[PDB]
């Protein structure tokens, strides 16, 4: 049993809810929250901007030190950093950004990072301002992630379309 509430079960291991991932993280304090990161860990907008704002910019300060030491992530890659006030850890995962022309096949590689963690609270990778089709993102998630993933979908209209169209 765990602390996640109000989720619809899609598969053995994937669950979904219409929720603000920031508000969900603050309530649950999951072991892992996933950030929709870019390779520079510049948390300006979308999910990343919202998570970083909720940490009072401490996520960005930590991220700047990580990049200064290690250089940029790979598209499809990840790093584990602090979850600050939101979670024990934040898994920063880089899905391809269609608005930068990145290869959508890298979305599967991005989701493979989730398999290193038994339970995660996450957004749909490459959705929102990353430009991918969220229906596609949910399909890749279900077909790639084997660990237990609790997906938060901000937009109620999109949530209802994801559920209604789910095969």
UniProtKB/Swiss-Prot annotation:
Inhibited in vitro by GRL-0617. It is found in: Host endoplasmic reticulum membrane. It is a multi-pass membrane protein. Residues 1-167 form the Macro domain. It catalyses: Thiol-dependent hydrolysis of ester, thioester, amide, peptide and isopeptide bonds formed by the C-terminal Gly of ubiquitin (a 76-residue protein attached to proteins as an intracellular targeting signal). Changing residue 164 to L: In strain: Gamma/P.1. Coiled coil: none annotated. Responsible for the cleavages located at the N-terminus of the replicase polyprotein. Participates together with nsp4 in the assembly of virally-induced cytoplasmic double-membrane vesicles necessary for viral replication. Antagonizes innate immune induction of type I interferon by blocking the phosphorylation, dimerization and subsequent nuclear translocation of host IRF3. Also prevents host NF-kappa-B signaling. In addition, PL-PRO possesses a deubiquitinating/deISGylating activity and processes both 'Lys-48'- and 'Lys-63'-linked polyubiquitin chains from cellular substrates. May form homohexamers. Interacts with N protein. This is Papain-like protease nsp3. It comes from Severe acute respiratory syndrome coronavirus 2.
């Amino acid at each position: 049993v765990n602390s996640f509430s109000g989720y619809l079960k899609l598969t053995d291991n994937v669950y979904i809810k219409n929720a603000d991932i920031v508000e969900e993280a603050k309530k649950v304090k999951p072991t892992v929250v996933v950030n929709a990161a870019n390779v520079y860990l510049k948390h300006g907008g979308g999910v990343a901007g919202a998570l970083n704002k909720a940490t009072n910019n401490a996520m960005q300060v930590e991220s700047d030190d990580y990049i200064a030491t290690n250089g940029p992530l790979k598209v499809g890659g990840s790093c584990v950093l602090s979850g600050h006030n939101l979670a024990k850890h934040c898994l920063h995962v880089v899905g391809p950004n269609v608005n930068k022309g990145e290869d959508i096949q890298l979305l599967k590689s991005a989701y493979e990072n989730f398999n290193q963690h038994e339970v995660l609270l996450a957004p749909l990778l490459s959705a929102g301002i990353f430009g991918a089709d969220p229906i596609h993102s949910l399909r890749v998630c279900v077909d790639t992630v084997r660990t237990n993933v609790y997906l938060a979908v901000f937009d109620k209209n999109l949530y209802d379309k994801l559920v209604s169209s789910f095969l």
